[PDB]
């Protein structure tokens, strides 16, 4: 016997998914009551709501073996249940798709595209995804009608191919494209920050060499390397993760402190060219006051912001990877055996339960990758 095992699996999975999603949604609401609400909160909350939809529509009917034994009831009940199941599946896929699109928007081209965003837990992409999930699952009202309930129907193979293409292959390919684009952008930002760090390092090393230099050369020299490093550094604009507008600190406060820095380098070079090495040493010390004012804080801020966006992108990538690895085993079976296909694919429940494990584990992934929810140890 294996029906009891399936029932126990479904019961524990419902418990886990419902509890985790409810706890994370409650933490989101609590943090919203404070001044710690963020744009990503709507996306995570609606992904949680899609997970609850999966739990209550796609998992509850199967768990109840006194109601899914023969799907007793009027055809309206079965039609509604199947429509809700497909809506939940579409929503679970497309909320992750929307999250990845949000990452692409807020990393590749972080503009003021959060129009009509609100703390009421809704925005344009998520409502678009929900509406698309509702529309694309409409065909489910014209298939299942009190057949025990069964499909009423080339129709089956074509429909299953369409479902796997719309729910899994197309969203997954879009997500993969967005992820490769985001990876490229993040690598570009990392390389730019590494270049700025290297320029700062060259500045510091040549300052040390000037401090320990004892002749005209190594001062006239090692100031040219500093000047080249400063010229290269002031050109490096902040990554797309931060805005670039006039009066911004990064436009004036950064490339004005660098102007004073290069001016002091020029003064040191002017002194060195006259043989006044001792005088040129004083400019070396003078340069530190400008070095530690405009640039060190900018480097710290850039590193911290890059780390934060990298953490969010890693969270999204983990969610996507779990999504694919948990849903592909189920969709592939249908795709391979829905054509009447080499044989009959007897195992059905376990694959769908494994798929729902993804919805079970999303809230844990978010909490692990989120400091706001991680600090919510005491409830």
């Amino acid at each position, epitope marked *: 016997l294996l029906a009891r095992a399936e029932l126990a699996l479904l019961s524990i999975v419902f418990v886990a998914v419902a509890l985790s999603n409810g706890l994370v949604l409650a933490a989101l609401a609590r943090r919203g009551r404070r001044g710690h609400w963020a744009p990503i909160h709507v996306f995570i909350g609606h992904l949680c709501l899609a997970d609850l939809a999966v739990a209550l529509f796609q998992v509850l009917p199967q768990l109840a073996w006194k109601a899914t034994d023969r799907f007793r009831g009027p055809d309206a009940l079965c039609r509604a249940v199947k429509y809700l199941q497909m809506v939940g599946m579409y929503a679970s896929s497309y909320m992750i798709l929307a999250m990845t699109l949000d990452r692409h928007r807020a990393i590749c081209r972080p503009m003021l595209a959060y129009r009509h965003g609100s703390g009421a837990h809704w925005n344009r992409p998520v409502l678009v995804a929900w509406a698309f999930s509702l529309l694309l699952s409409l065909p489910q009202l014209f298939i299942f009608a009190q057949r025990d309930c069964w499909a009423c129907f080339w129709g089956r193979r074509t429909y299953v191919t369409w479902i796997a293409l719309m729910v899994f292959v197309a969203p997954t390919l879009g997500i993969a494209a967005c992820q490769v684009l985001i990876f490229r952008e993040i690598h570009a930002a990392r390389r730019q920050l590494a270049d700025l760090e290297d320029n700062w390092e060259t500045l510091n090393d040549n300052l040390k060499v000037i401090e320990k230099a004892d002749n005209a050369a190594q001062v006239k020299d090692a100031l*040219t*390397k500093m*000047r080249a490093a400063a*010229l*290269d550094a002031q*050109k490096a604009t902040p990554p797309k993760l931060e805005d670039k507008s006039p009066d911004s600190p990064e436009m004036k406060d950064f490339r004005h402190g660098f102007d004073i820095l290069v001016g002091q380098i020029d003064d040191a070079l002017k002194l060195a*060219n006259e043989g006044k090495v001792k005088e040129a040493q004083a400019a070396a010390e003078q340069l530190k006051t400008t070095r530690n004012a405009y640039i060190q804080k900018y480097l710290e801020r850039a590193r911290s912001t890059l780390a934060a966006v990298a953490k969010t992108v890693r969270m999204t990538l983990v969610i996507v990877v779990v999504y694919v690895l948990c849903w592909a085993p189920f969709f592939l079976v249908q795709l391979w055996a829905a054509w009447d296909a080499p044989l009959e694919g007897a195992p059905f429940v376990l694959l769908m339960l494994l798929a729902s494990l993804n919805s079970c584990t999303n809230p844990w992934i978010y909490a692990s990758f989120s400091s706001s929810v991680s600090s919510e140890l005491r409830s």
Partner: antibody, heavy 124, light 109 residues
Framework: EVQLVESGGGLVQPGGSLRLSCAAS????????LHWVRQAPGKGLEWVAY????????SYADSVKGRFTISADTSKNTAYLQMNSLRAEDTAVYYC?????????????????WGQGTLVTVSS | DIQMTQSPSSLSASVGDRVTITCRAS??????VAWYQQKPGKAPKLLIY???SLYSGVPSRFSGSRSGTDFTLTISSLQPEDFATYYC??????????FGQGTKVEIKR
């Protein structure tokens, strides 16, 4: 309109002395550093000297240091280059170029208004 | 003492032909590199005033580019009046300006 005009080039025996005057019109030498760049007959350009009138910060190339003297007169808005102890390879066409100051874009525009160039030949 | 070697000592091309000239610097100067054009008996003419920045009055066919320590000047549609020597200067500091040896572009036949 901006224009540099060179004068003073001519024939001087080796070991003699010469003076090259670069006159600027359309701008003040105080706002720009005036460089002297010489090109030998059938050869590439090479930088000879420069003067910054605001700071009085002269400079010279390793092959002319100690023999060339670059000065500037803002009243006449001209730059003078006095060449002494001339040698055989000092023969060339000397252009007077103009270079902005660091703070802004005028610096990032390298020599952008050259002069006509004056030819000096030294031979026995 | 920053060398500015210009590899193509001379180059032959025909009208409508893309021509590329390269320059390499001993140290790592910044985008402080300019490209000039000199015709026989005339003072140079600032074509590119940064690593890649067209001057005000230069035709748009000229285009400069930089990659690390290697700079390049490219002419897409070589016109009959694009035949002239081309020089590559590094101008990191007032007393550190050095030119290249120059490439003479000639007509093909």
């Amino acid at each position: 309109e901006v224009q540099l005009v060179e004068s003073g080039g001519g024939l001087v025996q080796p070991g003699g002395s010469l003076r090259l005057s670069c006159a600027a019109s359309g701008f003040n030498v105080v706002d720009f550093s005036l460089h002297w760049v010489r090109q030998a007959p059938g050869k590439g350009l090479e930088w000879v000297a420069y003067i910054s009138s605001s700071s009085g910060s002269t400079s010279y190339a390793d092959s002319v240091k100690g023999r060339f003297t670059i000065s500037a007169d803002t009243s006449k808005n001209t730059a003078y280059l006095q060449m002494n102890s001339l040698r055989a390879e000092d023969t060339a066409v000397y252009y007077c170029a103009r270079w902005g100051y660091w703070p802004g874009e005028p610096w990032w525009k390298a020599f952008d208004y050259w002069g006509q160039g004056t030819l000096v030949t030294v031979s026995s | 003492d920053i060398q500015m070697t210009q590899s193509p000592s001379s180059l032959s091309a025909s009208v409508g032909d893309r021509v590329t000239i390269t320059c390499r610097a001993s140290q790592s100067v910044s985008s402080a590199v300019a490209w000039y054009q000199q015709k026989p008996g005339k003072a140079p003419k600032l074509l590119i005033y940064s690593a890649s920045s067209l001057y005000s009055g230069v035709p748009s066919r000229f285009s400069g580019s930089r990659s690390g320590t290697d700079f390049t000047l490219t002419i897409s549609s070589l016109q009959p009046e694009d035949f002239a020597t081309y020089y590559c200067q590094q101008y990191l500091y007032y007393s550190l300006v050095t030119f290249g040896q120059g490439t003479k572009v000639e007509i093909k036949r």
